[PDB]
Write a protein that binds this ligand. Structure first.
Ligand SMILES: C[S@@+](CC[C@H](N)C(=O)[O-])C[C@H]1O[C@@H](n2cnc3c(N)ncnc32)[C@H](O)[C@@H]1O
Ligand SMILES: [Zn+2]
Ligand SMILES: [Zn+2]
Ligand SMILES: [Zn+2]
Length: 427
């Protein structure tokens, strides 16, 4: 990592700082996955090995639950895939390790195959990851123990297990340092370890964005970075108010952020936009609605697992209409529910409903999110793809170009996603 260095960032543990200028769109560095796993729901849609999306992926003939571009990808994936190939046959319907277990199994396999420092650990090694072991409550430890039991239960034929203490440290490290890989529409693809990328601290006004080229992580400047400046990503969805962001940061990462966004709260008021109405909603009425909104968000998070698509849409409508007594359409809590509703429409292949939702989401998104934001870019892309399918060519092309302009900065001009999107314009 030539023009960067590891340092002690006061109050933030270890960090990464620049030793040379980076301009907007510059590639700071890339980092090959140390370990990674394609999410179960994407099997048969993306190659397990390289994450390429393709119809007609070649199926593993033993387990019938792993798919590849070709024999090369299948062969290359085998050292990792063998941890699950036979167990999936043996266990059948009962094979259900969490994705965290699946990834941690591959970390252990990699440590056996390649004990020495890898090219993904030039500045920070997996073994050096922060765990926050001393901060875990009974709830978190109970979860880690359940994962350790699943790891032993499902992987015992192919993996050597370290002792319980070591596995607790490892799973905690995975929690603190683990990445999720998303596609160009920000759909969940899988989980990965990128040790050098894990070195970067958080800010709610980040100067870099991490994107993915298959299983390769790339890090590009979204603000000008000068020598001596610390390099920050955002660990979280930047849509939400300062309190909401920090509750998540404390809960998952055990810190409170003190960036300019969290210090000033300059953007909080517009995020929680209140209807004028001439006779304004009172302070405690506004307090109560924010509390209810944050509760329905959680209520919905778990509601997905049971309820039907029509049922989920119903509760989006109901909460939307309840909040609209006080909240503007641009209100972040209203945006959240609208965004969930859009996802339900897309699954239902109700393209027109999806589109009507996207159109009400996009302008507020552009306001609340930073200048270059993958959340904004992916919304433009979904919009453009929806317009194109409805044969709204002009509107489609416009929205796709909006996506490209952001993506050229975050993903690089030469990124395969940009070529693909340009081909959707030429077709
Ligand atoms: C992915 S690690 C980042 C590298 C880490 N600081 C280290 O020394 O290994 C995530 C952890 O870094 C720390 N951290 C990251 N950003 C921070 C910030 N802005 N303020 C305080 N601590 C931060 C927290 O302890 C968090 O759990
Ligand atoms: Zn492949
Ligand atoms: Zn198999
Ligand atoms: Zn912040």
């Amino acid at each position: 990592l030539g023009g960067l260095e590891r340092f002690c960032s006061p109050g933030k543990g270890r960090g990464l700082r620049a030793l040379q200028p980076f301009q907007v769109g510059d590639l700071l560095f890339s980092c090959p996955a140390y370990a990674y796993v394609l999410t179960v729901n994407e099997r048969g849609n993306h190659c397990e090995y390289c994450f390429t999306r393709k119809e007609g992926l070649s199926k593993c003939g033993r387990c019938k639950q792993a798919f590849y571009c070709n024999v090369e990808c299948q062969k290359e994936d085998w050292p990792m895939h063998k941890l699950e190939c036979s167990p999936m046959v043996v266990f059948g319907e009962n094979w259900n390790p969490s994705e965290t277990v699946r990834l941690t199994a591959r970390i252990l396999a990699k440590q056996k195959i390649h004990p020495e420092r890898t090219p993904s650990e030039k500045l920070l090694a997996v073994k050096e990851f922060e765990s926050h072991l001393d901060k875990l409550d009974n709830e978190k430890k109970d979860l880690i123990q359940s994962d350790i039991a699943a790891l032993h239960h499902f992987y015992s034929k192919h993996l050597g297990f370290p002792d319980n203490d070591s596995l607790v440290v490892l799973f905690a490290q995975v929690n603190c340092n683990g990445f999720t890989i998303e596609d160009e529409e920000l759909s969940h693809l899988g989980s990965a370890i990128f040790p050098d990328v894990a070195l970067m601290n958080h800010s709610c006004c980040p100067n870099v964005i991490v994107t993915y080229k298959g299983t390769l992580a790339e890090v590009r400047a979204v603000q000008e970075i000068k020598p001596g400046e610390e390099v920050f990503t955002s660990y979280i969805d930047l849509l939400y108010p300062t309190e909401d962001r920090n509750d998540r940061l404390r809960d998952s990462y055990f810190f409170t952020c003190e960036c300019q966004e969290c210090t000033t709260k300059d953007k909080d008021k517009a995020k929680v936009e209140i209807r004028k109405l001439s006779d304004p909603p009172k302070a405690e009425a506004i307090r109560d609605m924010v509390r209810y909104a944050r509760n329905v968000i959680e209520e919905f998070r778990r509601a997905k697992h049971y309820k039907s698509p029509s049922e989920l849409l119903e509760i989006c409508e109901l909460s939307q209409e309840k909040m609209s007594s006080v909240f503007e359409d641009s209100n972040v809590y209203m945006l959240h529910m609208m965004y969930q509703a859009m996802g339900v429409c897309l699954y239902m292949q109700d393209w027109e409903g999806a589109l009507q939702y996207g159109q009400k989401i996009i302008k507020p998104y552009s306001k609340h999110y930073p200048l270059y934001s993958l959340n904004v870019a992916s919304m433009w892309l979904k919009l453009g793809r929806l317009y194109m399918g409805l044969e709204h060519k002009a509107a489609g092309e416009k929205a796709l170009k909006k996506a490209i302009a952001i993506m050229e900065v975050a993903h690089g001009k030469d990124h395969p996603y940009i070529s693909e999107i340009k081909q959707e314009i030429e077709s």
